[PDB]
Amino acid sequence: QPAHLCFRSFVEALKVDNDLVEINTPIDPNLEAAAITRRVCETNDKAPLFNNLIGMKNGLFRILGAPGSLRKSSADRYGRLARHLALPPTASMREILDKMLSASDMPPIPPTIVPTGPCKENSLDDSEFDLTELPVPLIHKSDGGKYIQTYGMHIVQSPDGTWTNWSIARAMVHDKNHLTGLVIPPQHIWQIHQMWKKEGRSDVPWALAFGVPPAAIMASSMPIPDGVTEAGYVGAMTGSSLELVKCDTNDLYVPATSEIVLEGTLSISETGPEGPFGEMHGYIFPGDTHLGAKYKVNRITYRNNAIMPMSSCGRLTDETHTMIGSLAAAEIRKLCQQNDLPITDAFAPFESQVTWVALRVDTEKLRAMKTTSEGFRKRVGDVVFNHKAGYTIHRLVLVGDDIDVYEGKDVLWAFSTRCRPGMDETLFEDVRGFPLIPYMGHGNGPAHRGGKVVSDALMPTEYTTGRNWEAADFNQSYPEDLKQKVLDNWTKMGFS
């Protein structure tokens, strides 16, 4: 099966790409696997495949770290993400994001039910497994539990059956047959959970599938609209109907080639201790445990020689930057355009810890609007900060056509030089805030409200008559013929 449709094939692809290190000697899931993966992510090294994990038994499990992290070279920097999507390994971020958005103006392609698949090769009933006995990793030394779930897909369905959501939300082992995790607004797992809670009759049927089709884990990480079934979006994106098999103990459907599947329920009444966890912004607050959602596991099914993907998240650069930030930016770009805003491109700079999004403006269209900075900033911020796709983002930076938003150096240059602090900014205190940013949940103000800003790095004439400067750089401050002469004589003269 193709790499984008089958996680086991994706691992093969990374090998072929010389983007995998297989470690066949014993590695401890207590910190060691995650420490190696952390170093990989901080250095953009090859993805680690831990084939000999201390405590692996009943055939559960090997670990792949850094599945969505960056490669060292500029030419294939985003190659691991490209391999989730059937794209060439040299694909740009713009091409990746365009692929992820493509299904938003296509009919869904619903999944196809098949009678079995690799994920049924082995099973353990509720007398046979113990989650505390599996080689679940301790990812950061101060974590409040062993985080089994960092790169699987939670599957829940609305009570009426009309929306089945696929998403990534963290979860850790509670005891032999339960997990605790985050289920928080405005996320779709929360929205669905609230539907079940209001009905009040039963716990939520649930499954958690690890090592799903790579195209599916990408949509799982993206804030596509409310009420949209990810399976149909991924079908449209890939041009093919995804093959799903029914769970054994409930009527949910999981990808046929899933590495590992947990079946059970998400409680509408029970909670348990969850966290702390070393998170996307680069921090852990030791001891900050709070009550989280509680999951009961009834059954495990899995492939022969199952592989568990793992994100060792924190400081730059890992899946929480490359996927959470970029995919939110993509959805924001679309949102803006659908609201008649002249936004061509959006990206969450990694340098901002993916807390900013830079919005590139078609300034010809802006000029025709005959507006001002104050008005335009307010409009943009009301659209984005009142929408779920804006949830994680606390600063929007508006830039004109000369800036490549996918280049952090250029966004930083424009922000620092074109946006006057205070005057060229609008603060938003009555919007939903993202509590995981330290200055929110551990800060001086309300954890869940405010702390957002639109920073206008458009210069005045960009609203009126057009750009009135040239950059003082090699590109813009010298005529073409001179530039080319310099380049052509560069190494002759003695330069590198």
* Residue 164 contacts ligand 4LU per CB under 6 A: no
The minimum distance between CB 250 and Mn ion, in angstroms, equals: 20
Sheet holding 47-50, edge to edge: 20-23, 47-50, 62-65, 307-310
CA dihedral defined by 314, 316, 317, 320, rounded to 10 degrees? 40
Under rule CB under 6 A, residue 311 binds ligand 4LU: yes
CA angle in degrees (0–180, nearest 5) for 73-74-80: 70
**Smallest separation (angstroms) from ligand 4M4 to the CB of 255:** 16
Select the binding partner of residue 326 from ligand 4M4, K ion, Mn ion, none (C-beta < 5 to 8 A, by kind).
none
The answer to whether 363 contacts its own copies (rule: CB under 8 A) is no
If one asks whether residue 222 binds ligand 4LU (CB under 6 A), the answer comes out as: yes
CB 123 within 8 A of CB 260: no
* Residue entry with tokens 């509408």: 268
Q: Which of 418, 401, 417, 404 is nearest to 363 (CA)?
A: 401
Near ligand 4M4 by CB under 6 A: residue from 3, 100, 109, 440: 3
Q: Is 268 in the site for ligand 4M4 (CB under 6 A)?
A: no
- Catalytic residue among 263, 279, 331, 425, which? 279
239 touches, from Mn ion, ligand 4LU, its own copies, none (C-beta below 5 to 8 Å by class): none
Residue 242 as a binder of ligand 4M4 (CB under 6 A): the answer is no
| Span from 70-78, 268-276, 319-327, 341-349 in contact with ligand 4LU (CB under 6 A) | 319-327
Using only C-alpha atoms, the chain has a radius of gyration, in whole angstroms, of: 24
333 binds, among Mn ion, its own copies, ligand 4M4, none (CB under 5 to 8 A by kind): none
Q: Is 447 in the site for its own copies (CB under 8 A)?
A: no
20 binding ligand 4M4? (CB under 6 A)? no
Q: Which stretch binds K ion (CB under 5 A): 52-60, 159-167, 265-273, 296-304?
A: 159-167
In this chain, which stretch among 52-60, 186-194, 203-211, 455-463 interacts with ligand 4LU, using CB under 6 A? 186-194
Q: Which two three-digit tokens encode residue 429?
A: 């205190």
**214/83 Cα distance (integer angstroms):** 8
Q: Which two tokens stand for residue 230?
A: 């990810």
Q: In this structure, what token pair is assigned to residue 78?
A: 């985003």
| 279 noted as active-site residue | yes
Among residues 221 and 455, whose Cβ is nearest to ligand 4LU?
221
For β-strands 164-167 and 62-65, DSSP reports them as unpaired
CA 282 to chain centre: 15
Q: Is 335 in the site for ligand 4M4 (CB under 6 A)?
A: no
d(CA 79, CA 92): 9
Question: Going residue by residue from 434 to 463, which x/- string records binding to ligand 4M4, judged by CB under 6 A?
Answer: --x---------------------------
Rule CB under 8 A: say whether 283 interacts with its own copies.
yes
127 or 416, CB closer to its own copies?
416
Which partner in its own copies, ligand 4M4, ligand 4LU, none is near 16 (CB below 5 to 8 A by kind)? ligand 4M4
Give the integer Cα–Cα distance in Å for 297 and 177: 5
Instruction: Pick one of Mn ion, its own copies, K ion, none as the site partner of residue 107 (Cβ within 5 to 8 A by kind).
Output: none
Question: Does 95 help bind its own copies (rule: CB under 8 A)?
Answer: no
Q: Which residues are annotated as a binding site?
A: 165-170, 187-188, 230, 388
Rounded Cα distance, 425 and 378, in Å: 9
List the interface residues with ligand 4LU, window 320-359 (CB under 6 A).
320, 323-324
User: Quick check: 488 binds its own copies (CB under 8 A)?
Assistant: no
Judged by CB, which is closer to ligand 4LU: 164, or 363?
164
Which tokens go with 249? 């103990």
For the stretch 458-462, contacts whose Cβ atoms lie closer than 8 Å and that sit 24 or more positions apart, written own/partner, are 458/361, 458/363, 458/366, 458/373, 458/376, 458/398, 458/399, 458/400, 458/418, 459/400, 459/418, 460/373, 462/361, 462/363, 462/366, 462/367, 462/400
* Catalytic positions: 279
Task: Summarize as ranges the residues that interact with Mn ion (CB under 5 A).
Answer: 165, 188
